[PDB]
């Protein structure tokens, strides 16, 4: 039986096993945290299968959603991990013990040490957080020597015809840019995006939310076409100055340690080359 510590955002359904043998992850947000703690994942999400950093490590896991109850029963899990937003949690808890995580109650680093406490993997969690602390410190000085300590960054993402801004803690590299590198954002990003985490934005106002640098997440090359072709977009100083960092959403959606390792080298190299 897990000690099942009381942690903000963490709800247990049933008796969490001390050493889970057969974990089904239905939350793309947490799959890579479980993988980093070398837990055995027999099910994972479509997002995890599509994440080019994580997928290598979960080839053997079956792709499942919360709507695949019979398929999940057939995997015989001894633990299911979900986001608190998920459908069918009552039905999932009838299959196996559930850990349900309410997003944002613990930050991108705490989520790992929290799983460490739940699963008796506090050593692995601590070794990674130590090394993350070391490189992030060194990498911030390097990138700011290039940009200047005061340079503003905006995090944005594209999905079909949808445009979003992100703050410090909604992925797309905001955790590295704004937390790890301590980069400022433009005034309207601070007052209109940071608190709520994400903002669905009209294409038309993008210039008023972009200062020195913009990180733009997309799942493929074609999604950016019409925006990037537009006069409005080409009118942005950050665009003219080639201060756009286009990133692969299929890994940059996430904040698990494996995804972050890739995102940190990618962002560092993009800022240094600018």
List keywords for this structure.
alpha/beta; globular; monomer; six-stranded mixed β-sheet; signal; zinc; Rossmann fold; five-stranded mixed β-sheet; 38% helix; 274 residues; 13 helices; 2 domains; Iron-hydroxamate ABC transporter substrate-binding protein
Task: Please characterize this protein's 3D structure.
The chain is of the alpha/beta class. It folds into two domains: 10-121, Nitrogenase molybdenum iron protein domain (Rossmann fold), CATH 3.40.50.1980; 145-273, 3-Layer(aba) Sandwich (Rossmann fold), CATH 3.40.50. 38% of the residues lie in helices and 18% in strands. It has helices spanning 31-36, 46-50, 69-74, 89-93, 110-119, 122-147, 174-180, 187-192, 225-229, 231-234, 237-240, 249-252, 257-273; strands at 10-13, 23-25, 41-44, 62-63, 79-83, 98-101, 153-159, 162-166, 198-200, 213-218, 244-248. It has a six-stranded mixed beta sheet with strand order 1-6-5-2-3-4. Strands 9-8-7-10-11 form a five-stranded mixed beta sheet. Helix 5 (110-119) runs antiparallel to helix 6 (122-147). The longest helix is centred in the middle third of the chain and has 26 residues, at 122-147. The protein is globular and about 55 Å long. The PDB classes it as metal binding protein. Keywords: Streptococcus pyogenes, siderophore, hydroxamate, FtsB, ABC transporter, alanine scanning, antibiotic strategy, ferrichrome, metal binding protein. The assembly is monomeric. The entry is titled "Structure of the siderophore periplasmic binding protein FtsB from Streptococcus pyogenes with ferrichrome bound". The protein: Iron-hydroxamate ABC transporter substrate-binding protein FtsB.
């Amino acid at each position: 039986l897990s000690p099942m510590p009381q942690i903000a955002g963490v709800t247990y359904y049933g008796d969490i096993p001390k050493q889970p043998k057969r974990v089904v992850s239905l939350a793309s947000t947490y799959t890579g945290y479980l993988k980093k703690l070398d837990m055995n994942l027999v099910g994972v999400t479509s997002y995890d299968k599509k994440n080019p950093i994580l997928a290598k490590t979960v080839k053997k896991a079956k792709q499942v959603a919360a709507t695949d109850l019979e398929a999940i029963t057939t995997l015989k899990p001894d633990l299911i991990v979900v986001g608190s937003t998920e459908e069918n949690i009552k039905q999932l808890a009838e299959i196996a013990p559930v850990i349900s995580i309410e997003y944002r109650k613990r930050d991108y680093l705490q989520v790992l040490s929290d799983f460490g406490r739940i699963f008796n993997k506090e050593g692995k969690a601590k070794k990674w957080l130590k090394d993350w602390k070391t490189k992030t410190a060194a990498y911030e000085k390097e990138v700011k020597a290039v940009t200047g300590d005061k340079a503003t960054f905006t995090i944005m993402g594209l999905y079909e015809k949808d445009v979003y801004l992100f703050g410090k803690d909604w992925g797309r590299g905001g955790e590295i840019i704004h937390q790890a590198f301590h980069y400022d954002a433009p005034e309207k990003v601070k007052t209109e995006v940071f608190k709520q985490g994400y903002l669905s934005l009209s294409q038309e106002v993008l210039p008023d939310y972009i200062g020195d640098y913009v990180v733009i997440a997309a799942e493929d090359d074609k999604t950016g076409s019409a925006l990037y072709e537009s006069k409005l977009w080409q009118s942005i100083p950050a665009v003219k100055k080639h201060h756009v960092i286009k990133v692969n959403a299929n890994v940059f959606y996430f904040t698990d340690p494996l995804s972050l390792e890739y995102q940190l080298e990618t962002l560092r190299e993009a800022i240094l080359s600018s």
